[PDB]
Amino acid sequence: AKCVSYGVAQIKAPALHSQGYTGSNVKVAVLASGIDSSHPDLNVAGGASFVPSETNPFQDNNSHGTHVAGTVLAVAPSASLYAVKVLGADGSGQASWIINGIEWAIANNMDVINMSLGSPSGSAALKAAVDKAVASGVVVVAAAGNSGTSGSSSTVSYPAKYPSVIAVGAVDSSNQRAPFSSVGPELDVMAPGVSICSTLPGGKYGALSGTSMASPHVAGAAALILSKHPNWTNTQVRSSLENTATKLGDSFYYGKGLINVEAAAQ
Ligand code: NA
């Protein structure tokens, strides 16, 4: 990655890099607003658009899909990225478009799905799609949501709210929960999500905050783990991440804590 970001070090990715593991031969689908494939710092292996008004998955007129793509690569430099456009420029997308993208990712044998997206409601069909992906052996990772807190109520977004998905909240560089990071019993793990510097459309770079920034740290971690243990099932990869996370506080706000890819990759 050309832009320096603390988040890579924080999850202990450099430890795997030093072991020689960089996520080689792992297919990661980035379900977002597209990826700017013209960016010098990004290679994209394939993709598809399901947004009828924005037909090109290899451009990104929102900027977050490109940023998320770069974070996956910062953490797993050798991962193969696929641009699955399911959100438009304003960062919103119809429920069915997201399901179409999940079905594409399954049919094209993705190893990891990163969904840096989240709505206040899901659907039986959306749950069925992520459940199908998991059943098919895909590691499914999603941003927990940027809806802050609501007393004792869960504020975790969909599809992160579904048990089959790894719901990722955001911490800052001191492991403090970000004020916007969604909370609830469905929250699984945390990753760096405040002022993360990554790639932006038009060969640019910049810091962004959000659980959509936290999520690709975990998607990239799964790619590192798979490169060390390509025989591990999604079940084993998920278990390794949750079981070896660094405890940060109450699981309502923190899940199991901060991912530690060094520990996870045993
Ligand atoms: Na979950």
Swiss-Prot record:
Subcellular localization(s) per the UniProt record = Secreted
What is the predominant subcellular site recorded for this chain?
secreted
Task: Please describe the relationship between pH and activity.
Answer: Optimum pH is 9.0.
Q: Where is the Peptidase S8 domain?
A: 5-265
Say which enzyme class the record assigns. hydrolase
User: So what does this thing catalyse?
Assistant: Hydrolysis of proteins with broad specificity for peptide bonds, and a preference for a large uncharged residue in P1. Hydrolyzes peptide amides
**What does the entry comment about cofactor binding?**
Binds 2 calcium ions per subunit.
Q: Name one GO molecular function term.
A: metal ion binding
This protein's GO cellular component annotations are:
extracellular region
EC annotation from Swiss-Prot or TrEMBL: 3.4.21.62
The GO annotation for biological process reads: fibrinolysis; proteolysis; sporulation resulting in formation of a cellular spore
Binding positions for Ca(2+) 1?
2, 41, 72
- Give the required cofactors: Ca(2+)
**What biotechnological or industrial uses does this protein have?**
Used as a detergent protease. Sold under the name Alcalase by Novozymes.
- Keyword annotations of the record: Calcium, Hydrolase, Metal-binding, Protease, Secreted, Serine protease, Signal, Sporulation, Zymogen
What's the family? Belongs to the peptidase S8 family.
Q: What is this protein called?
A: Subtilisin BPN'
Which species is the source of this protein? Bacillus amyloliquefaciens
Mind giving the lineage of the organism this protein is from? Bacteria, Bacillati, Bacillota, Bacilli, Bacillales
Q: Gene of origin?
A: apr
Shown stretch of the complete protein? 108 to 382 of 382
